[PDB]
Design an enzyme around this catalytic site. Structure first.
Site, PDB file in Angstrom:
ATOM      1  N   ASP A  30       0.817  -1.206   0.000  1.00 51.79           N
ATOM      2  CA  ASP A  30       0.000   0.000   0.000  1.00 51.79           C
ATOM      3  C   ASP A  30       0.860   1.269   0.000  1.00 51.79           C
ATOM      4  O   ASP A  30       1.684   1.465   0.893  1.00 51.79           O
ATOM      5  CB  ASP A  30      -0.978   0.009   1.198  1.00 51.79           C
ATOM      6  CG  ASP A  30      -1.387  -1.394   1.593  1.00 51.79           C
ATOM      7  OD1 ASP A  30      -1.270  -2.296   0.738  1.00 51.79           O
ATOM      8  OD2 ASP A  30      -1.793  -1.590   2.757  1.00 51.79           O
ATOM      9  N   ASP A  65      -9.311   8.237   0.437  1.00 50.86           N
ATOM     10  CA  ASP A  65      -9.391   9.524   1.113  1.00 50.86           C
ATOM     11  C   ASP A  65      -8.504  10.567   0.448  1.00 50.86           C
ATOM     12  O   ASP A  65      -8.931  11.689   0.186  1.00 50.86           O
ATOM     13  CB  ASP A  65      -8.975   9.378   2.584  1.00 50.86           C
ATOM     14  CG  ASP A  65      -7.950   8.267   2.742  1.00 50.86           C
ATOM     15  OD1 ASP A  65      -6.763   8.506   2.465  1.00 50.86           O
ATOM     16  OD2 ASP A  65      -8.359   7.156   3.141  1.00 50.86           O
ATOM     17  N   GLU A 105     -10.743  19.090   5.666  1.00 54.21           N
ATOM     18  CA  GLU A 105     -10.402  18.272   6.820  1.00 54.21           C
ATOM     19  C   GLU A 105      -8.995  17.685   6.752  1.00 54.21           C
ATOM     20  O   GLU A 105      -8.342  17.481   7.781  1.00 54.21           O
ATOM     21  CB  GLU A 105     -11.424  17.122   6.961  1.00 54.21           C
ATOM     22  CG  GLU A 105     -11.154  16.322   8.230  1.00 54.21           C
ATOM     23  CD  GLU A 105     -12.055  15.129   8.422  1.00 54.21           C
ATOM     24  OE1 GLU A 105     -13.271  15.203   8.141  1.00 54.21           O
ATOM     25  OE2 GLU A 105     -11.547  14.098   8.922  1.00 54.21           O
ATOM     26  N   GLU A 106      -8.515  17.402   5.556  1.00 53.65           N
ATOM     27  CA  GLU A 106      -7.259  16.753   5.260  1.00 53.65           C
ATOM     28  C   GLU A 106      -6.049  17.661   5.377  1.00 53.65           C
ATOM     29  O   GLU A 106      -4.908  17.205   5.470  1.00 53.65           O
ATOM     30  CB  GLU A 106      -7.273  16.234   3.805  1.00 53.65           C
ATOM     31  CG  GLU A 106      -8.246  15.087   3.533  1.00 53.65           C
ATOM     32  CD  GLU A 106      -8.419  14.232   4.771  1.00 53.65           C
ATOM     33  OE1 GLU A 106      -7.410  13.630   5.210  1.00 53.65           O
ATOM     34  OE2 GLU A 106      -9.558  14.172   5.284  1.00 53.65           O
ATOM     35  N   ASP A 113     -15.365  18.348   3.648  1.00 49.98           N
ATOM     36  CA  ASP A 113     -14.925  17.033   4.090  1.00 49.98           C
ATOM     37  C   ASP A 113     -15.010  16.150   2.845  1.00 49.98           C
ATOM     38  O   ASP A 113     -16.102  15.748   2.426  1.00 49.98           O
ATOM     39  CB  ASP A 113     -15.802  16.578   5.245  1.00 49.98           C
ATOM     40  CG  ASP A 113     -15.356  15.363   6.015  1.00 49.98           C
ATOM     41  OD1 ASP A 113     -14.364  14.706   5.631  1.00 49.98           O
ATOM     42  OD2 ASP A 113     -16.016  15.031   7.029  1.00 49.98           O
ATOM     43  N   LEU A 151     -14.248  13.143   2.146  1.00 48.99           N
ATOM     44  CA  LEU A 151     -14.821  11.808   2.341  1.00 48.99           C
ATOM     45  C   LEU A 151     -15.108  11.609   3.817  1.00 48.99           C
ATOM     46  O   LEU A 151     -14.225  11.459   4.657  1.00 48.99           O
ATOM     47  CB  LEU A 151     -13.867  10.755   1.782  1.00 48.99           C
ATOM     48  CG  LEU A 151     -14.429   9.400   1.364  1.00 48.99           C
ATOM     49  CD1 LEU A 151     -15.636   9.524   0.443  1.00 48.99           C
ATOM     50  CD2 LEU A 151     -13.356   8.569   0.671  1.00 48.99           C
ATOM     51  N   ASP A 152     -16.379  11.626   4.218  1.00 54.80           N
ATOM     52  CA  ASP A 152     -16.653  11.516   5.646  1.00 54.80           C
ATOM     53  C   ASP A 152     -17.244  10.142   5.959  1.00 54.80           C
ATOM     54  O   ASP A 152     -17.979   9.621   5.116  1.00 54.80           O
ATOM     55  CB  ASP A 152     -17.609  12.613   6.106  1.00 54.80           C
ATOM     56  CG  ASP A 152     -17.742  12.712   7.615  1.00 54.80           C
ATOM     57  OD1 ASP A 152     -18.739  12.161   8.121  1.00 54.80           O
ATOM     58  OD2 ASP A 152     -16.899  13.325   8.312  1.00 54.80           O
ATOM     59  N   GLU A 177     -18.349  20.065   8.809  1.00 55.95           N
ATOM     60  CA  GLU A 177     -19.263  18.984   9.168  1.00 55.95           C
ATOM     61  C   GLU A 177     -20.553  19.558   9.757  1.00 55.95           C
ATOM     62  O   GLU A 177     -21.636  19.352   9.201  1.00 55.95           O
ATOM     63  CB  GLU A 177     -18.603  18.005  10.136  1.00 55.95           C
ATOM     64  CG  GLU A 177     -17.705  16.960   9.509  1.00 55.95           C
ATOM     65  CD  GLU A 177     -16.918  16.159  10.529  1.00 55.95           C
ATOM     66  OE1 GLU A 177     -16.808  16.621  11.683  1.00 55.95           O
ATOM     67  OE2 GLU A 177     -16.403  15.071  10.185  1.00 55.95           O
TER      68      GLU A 177
END
Ligand SMILES: Nc1ncnc2c1ncn2[C@@H]1O[C@H](COP(=O)(O)O)[C@@H](O)[C@H]1O
Ligand SMILES: Nc1ncnc2c1ncn2[C@@H]1O[C@H](COP(=O)(O)O)[C@@H](O)[C@H]1O
Ligand SMILES: O=P(O)(O)OC[C@H]1O[C@](O)(CO)[C@@H](O)[C@@H]1O
Ligand SMILES: O=P(O)(O)OC[C@H]1O[C@](O)(CO)[C@@H](O)[C@@H]1O
Ligand SMILES: [Mg+2]
Ligand SMILES: [Mg+2]
Ligand SMILES: [Tl+]
Ligand SMILES: [Tl+]
Ligand SMILES: [Tl+]
Ligand SMILES: [Tl+]
Ligand SMILES: [Tl+]
Ligand SMILES: [Tl+]
Ligand SMILES: [Tl+]
Ligand SMILES: [Tl+]
EC number: 3.1.3.11
Lengths: 327, 327
Positions: A60, A66, A89-90, A110, A112-113, A272
């Site tokens: 990986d 994400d 968020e990242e 966000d 991907l939440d 969010e």
């Protein structure tokens, strides 16, 4: 009279006499959500498992879902030429848009939440909130520190059994279903309103030991109602966009209050809590910390956290009365 | 090398020296699951909303998701020429295959489960259990009334953020991810084993007032652990296939015990509990009613219900000891 999101958005921009910049921004957002949906549904996963040879790099490092979703949103949004500041968020700090690609909007998202649900394939989604640049000085992180009340648009995409984009603006909430056979979001629910009272409560009861007396009392009431009415059902997917979407469409309440370990709550205010509080108010529901409207909170940090309680007005008022009861 | 589900079942059939009937049955199931997934993700929905006017329809003949899934499984199973008795949640009576398409297999299935979650786009799934006809009499409903212990294969498809097929057989459990770009399930997790002890509990606590004293004590223990460890998190999607899949992959425990309106539990033994109990035990997990192994119940009604508790052996064992203590 079928209505694609593309035509909806163009028409609201025409009705609002916009110059075309906010239209372009929403077009780009629609595009990034479709690309994220396709990756989330794992199209082309066979390549990763070496269908065309070269199945030794299993180690990986190939862009996690994400990181890819964040790259899509940032690149697509910059390419709209409608934004100047982006908050994700990242990223630790706000992303300032390059002068050449610069526009007047500020975007909190966000990408991907519902991160704890990714590996078990449970519903996940994308959350966004859009602001207009307020000052006239150099764009910077402070341009994202506006209360939710100043939102021009907010909503989410839910990657569930099907993919749906929910978009709230000043005149209301509309739900568009993605037709992945043609890459078109279709208007399926217009000017959506949440029901006055629900019959579902949504919270992680694993924190029961850390809840405040008000939340503790409310939950008891849902299970053992003093007036002996039917107890509420319980649902907690564990992805905010899915529990909130169910709340919008079926009614009831969603809670992530502060608790002894998370004294300020867990969910993030800018990308969010504000967007969903905005979707909830535009649908006739409420969004509170327990002591104040989420949208009226003045942010002081872009990754600031806030407690949130949202949903049917009657269910949320009931918990608020209980907070008042406990002084 | 990359392994498709098609290649996997074919090689598993060769190793077992089967005649190919069960291989054909499994390939048909894989085709039905792809077709259901595509419908669930709403491909083609623009046609419903009139993108081409109104002419591609002679009347009002259109089918709910649940009716369509049922029809895809029945017709695709029958066409495999491998079955003689089918049991569907959607039909009050067992379906007896016409002699010309008769094979030796009995299939119990839930073509689409988690119906309460369909309109809010939460994860839903397909559940199946396969038995060999153990008799020489004319095929009939009695051929479906076997204990889960007699299963030759079982599993489910989860239509969640992505589509995954989980298949359990005598040798173990395998998970295949659907790549919707090529219509191929790809083997991504081999001979899966649940963790011995989890950290998540999953139940509808809305029924708190109707729970037996053992469920009641267990839940309290999950929230206020005697050893002062960290309490378990709670998750309850409301779709058995989503909650059971998270259980398998993350560990912990899933519960639907008897309550008021379900004094024998709610979930259906033949096509809900048994398939999941079989996957769990093949994954090293446990599945009990509270008093006995789900797989050893001998049914008397194709639509009979049973209470169920399943997941990580140390967690289920802990609850079983509560029940034993009380007794
Ligand atoms: N497509 C649109 N949908 C809704 N409101 C819009 C749209 N385009 C413009 N507006 C409104 O008009 C304002 C100015 O738009 P613009 O000139 O594109 O920056 C926006 O901040 C919105 O309030
Ligand atoms: N594809 C397969 N995967 C696993 N077991 C198989 C397969 N094909 C056959 N078997 C086993 O062999 C038995 C006889 O197969 P058949 O002759 O096709 O009915 C089945 O009941 C299974 O127990
Ligand atoms: O496991 P917990 O503490 O309930 O957190 C789940 C919440 O966290 C989030 O994943 C945000 O990180 C939300 O999507 C979800 O509501
Ligand atoms: O709303 P309740 O009573 O918790 O029922 C939930 C259960 O109902 C079902 O939809 C019935 O199969 C399951 O998928 C799910 O586990
Ligand atoms: Mg988040
Ligand atoms: Mg069912
Ligand atoms: Tl976060
Ligand atoms: Tl993150
Ligand atoms: Tl995130
Ligand atoms: Tl969060
Ligand atoms: Tl049904
Ligand atoms: Tl069903
Ligand atoms: Tl059921
Ligand atoms: Tl059922």
């Amino acid at each position: 009279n079928i209505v694609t999101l593309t035509r909806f958005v163009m028409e609201e921009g025409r009705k609002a006499r916009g110059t075309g910049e906010m239209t372009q921004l929403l077009n780009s957002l629609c595009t990034a959500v479709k690309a994220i949906s396709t990756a989330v549904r794992k199209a082309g996963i066979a390549h990763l498992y070496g269908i065309a040879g070269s199945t030794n790099v299993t180690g990986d490092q190939v862009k996690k879902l994400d990181v890819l979703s964040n790259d899509l949103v940032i690149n697509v949004l910059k390419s709209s030429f409608a934004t100047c500041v982006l908050v994700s968020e990242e990223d630790k700090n706000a992303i300032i848009v390059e002068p050449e690609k610069r526009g007047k909007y500020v975007v909190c998202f966000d990408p991907l939440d519902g991160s704890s649900n990714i590996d078990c394939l449970v519903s996940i989604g994308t959350i966004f909130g859009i602001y207009r640049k307020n000052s006239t000085d150099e764009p910077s992180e402070k341009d994202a520190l506006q209360p939710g009340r100043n939102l021009v648009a907010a909503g989410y995409a839910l990657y569930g059994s099907a993919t749906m984009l929910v978009l709230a603006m000043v005149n209301g909430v509309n739900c568009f279903m993605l037709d992945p056979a043609i890459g078109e979001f279709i208007l399926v629910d217009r000017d959506v309103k949440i029901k006055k009272k629900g019959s579902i409560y949504s919270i992680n009861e694993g924190y029961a030991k850390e809840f405040d007396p008000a939340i503790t009392e409310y939950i008891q009431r849902k299970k053992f109602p003093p007036d002996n009415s039917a107890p509420y059902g319980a649902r907690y997917v564990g992805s905010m966009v899915a529990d909130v979407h169910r709340t919008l469409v079926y009614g009831g309440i969603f809670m992530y209050p502060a608790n002894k370990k998370s004294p300020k709550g867990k969910l993030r205010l800018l990308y969010e809590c504000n967007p969903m509080a905005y979707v909830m108010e535009k649908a006739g529901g409420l969004a509170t910390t327990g002591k104040e409207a989420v949208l009226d909170i003045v942010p002081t940090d872009i990754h600031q956290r806030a407690p949130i309680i949202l949903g049917s007005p009657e269910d949320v008022t009931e918990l608020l009365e209980i907070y008042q009861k406990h002084a």
